[PDB]
Amino acid sequence: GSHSMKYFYTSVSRPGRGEPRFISVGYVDDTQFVRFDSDAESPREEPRAPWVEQEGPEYWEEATRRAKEAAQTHRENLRTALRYYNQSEAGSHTIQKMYGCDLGPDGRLLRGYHQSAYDGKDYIALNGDLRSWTAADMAAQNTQRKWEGNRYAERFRAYLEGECLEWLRRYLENGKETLQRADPPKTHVTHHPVSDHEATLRCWALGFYPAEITLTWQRDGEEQTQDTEFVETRPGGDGTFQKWGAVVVPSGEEQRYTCHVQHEGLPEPLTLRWEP
C-alpha cells in the first residue's frame, strides 16, 4: 500500500570530553530496525528488528562502514559549522539529519526526503523536485552552493531510485508479518469524576500500528474542542502505539458525548460511547 524508509542522525559536540556523540537510527515506516551509537562499547550497526537479523556479515560490515563514515562526516560538519557561524570550540552544538524514500503502490519512487538542521533550527533541505536545495539562513547557503557545484542531489537521487527502494522492498518482504500489518486499536471509554458536578471522559486507543491515528470528541454530534485534552501518540514499548483523548463533561450529560477514532487498521471509523 504505502511504505517508507528513513534514516536519522544526531551529532553533539562535547568540548573537553573528546569526540562528539553520534547516534543514528533506521526506520521502516514506524518500525526501527537498526542502530549505531558512537559511545557503544563496540560501535557498529546493530539489529533492532527480528526481521533484519537474517542479513549476512556483508550487510553489517558495509552498514557499519557507512555509519562510521557518516560520523566522520558529522564531526567535519560540526567544525565547518563552527566556522560558518563563527562559533567557539568551547561550546556545544548539535547537527541533525533525516533522509529517506517512499515506495509507491506501483513499486516506484513516490517522494524523497533529505533535510538537515543545526542547533534545533532548519539548516538545509532538499526540495520536492529532488533537484534543488533550500537553505534556511546565510551560513547554509555556503552548503547550498557547494552541493550545487558538485551535483550532490544527483547522487543522493541515484541512491533514492536505487539502493533505497531495493532494500526497502527487501525489508518489507522479510518482515511482512510485522511491516505489512494494520493492527486496529483496542479502544474503550473510561469515566473519571473531577468533582461533584464534573467528570472527565477519556477515550483510549491501544496497541495500534502504524502510529497514524485521529481521536476526536463530539457533543450531540457536533465537534468539541472546548475543555479537551489530546496527548501525543506514544509507544507501548513492544512495537505498538497508544493515544487517548479526554473531555471535561457536566455530570448527567455523559451520554451526549461520543468518541471518534480513525486508523487505517479499522474497516470504518469507530463511534464509542461510555459503557458503564
Binding site: 563514515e69 560538519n77 557547494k146 541512491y159
Partner: peptide
C-alpha cells in the same frame, strides 16, 4: 541501506 552522506 544507508546513503553516503557528504560534508557541509
Amino acid at each position: 541501506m544507508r546513503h553516503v552522506l557528504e560534508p557541509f
